[PDB]
Design a protein around this ligand. Structure first.
Ligand SMILES: [Zn+2]
Lengths: 116, 141
């Protein structure tokens, strides 16, 4: 859709669960689409900087999760189309990750990149 | 499994090409001439060409028509082996973490190692640790 497309290249962040790369204005107004009920992002800015982090590299133009090898490798087949990444460095604090497992959300590390 | 193709591009324009391609796909997805491209990879370390995912060469050949940026890489479509379908996504250590060591390019402390202390969420300025090198105003006039 036209709501998930980044509008301006400057001031872009990325999520850590589904690695959703968009613009800060969309994050403040729309927020993470693939996971909204379990993350509570729409209607505030502090949580954006709490969970999402700008430390990420790599961009991919994802259009068909159901039929693509990159999606299977990244484990993002059950997500909506959009611009994702391949390496998001970061880790959520010990106050938000706890409730994800209780509600039936498996927290995995999307930082597929290697260290040294 | 789908194949990954390679197309040449200009040096310094990789995110603009990606956003233009996504806009074209979104604008021409409900028409009689859709795009069969699955995905494109634009790694940050590489600069000078981009990748594209599709089964046949005709798909990407007819999907990059009209664009004025990929005109250079239009008469040749190279195919990479299946073993290279996993090294492109690899990244060697983004690169923004506090209490880390970074280097400077401009200023006076050129080619010197420093250390990060605090990061501003505004993404406009960042603190840095370094030992001063000035002469304390004794040599200069
Ligand atoms: Zn996410």
């Amino acid at each position: 859709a036209l709501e998930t497309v980044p509008k301006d290249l400057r001031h872009l962040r990325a999520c850590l669960l589904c690695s959703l790369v968009k613009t800060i204005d969309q994050f403040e107004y729309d927020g993470c689409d693939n996971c909204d009920a379990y993350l509570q992002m729409k209607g505030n800015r502090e949580m954006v900087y709490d969970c999402t982090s700008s430390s990420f590299d790599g961009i991919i133009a994802m259009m068909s999760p159901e039929d693509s090898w990159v999606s299977k490798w990244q484990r993002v087949s059950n997500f909506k189309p959009g611009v994702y990444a391949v390496s998001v460095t970061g880790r959520l604090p010990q106050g938000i990750v706890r409730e994800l497992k209780s509600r039936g959300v498996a927290y995995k590390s999307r930082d597929t990149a290697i260290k040294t | 499994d789908p194949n990954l193709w390679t197309v040449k591009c200009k040096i310094g324009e990789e995110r603009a090409t990606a956003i233009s391609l996504m806009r074209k796909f979104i604008a021409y997805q409900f028409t009689d001439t859709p795009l069969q491209i699955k995905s494109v990879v634009a790694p940050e370390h590489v600069k000078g060409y981009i990748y594209v995912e599709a089964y046949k060469q005709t798909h990407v050949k007819q999907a990059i028509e009209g664009v004025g940026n990929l005109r250079l890489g239009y008469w040749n479509q190279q195919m990479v082996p299946i073993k290279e379908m996993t090294d492109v996504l690899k990244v060697v250590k983004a690169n923004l973490k506090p209490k880390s060591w970074v280097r400077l390019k401009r200023g006076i402390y050129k080619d010197d190692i420093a250390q990060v202390d605090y990061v501003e969420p505004s993404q406009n300025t960042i603190s840095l640790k370094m030992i001063p090198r000035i002469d304390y105003d004794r040599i200069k006039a």
